[PDB]
Nucleic acid binder design. Sequence first.
DNA 1: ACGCC
Length: 18
Amino acid sequence: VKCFNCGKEGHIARNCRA
DNA sequence: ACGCC
Ligand SMILES: [Zn+2]
């Protein structure tokens, strides 16, 4: 499943960084 | 930013 803050694989929106 | 993993 994919991060949606960035759109990369693995990690969460909430913990993203962009 | 939110949700899930
Ligand atoms: Zn991300």
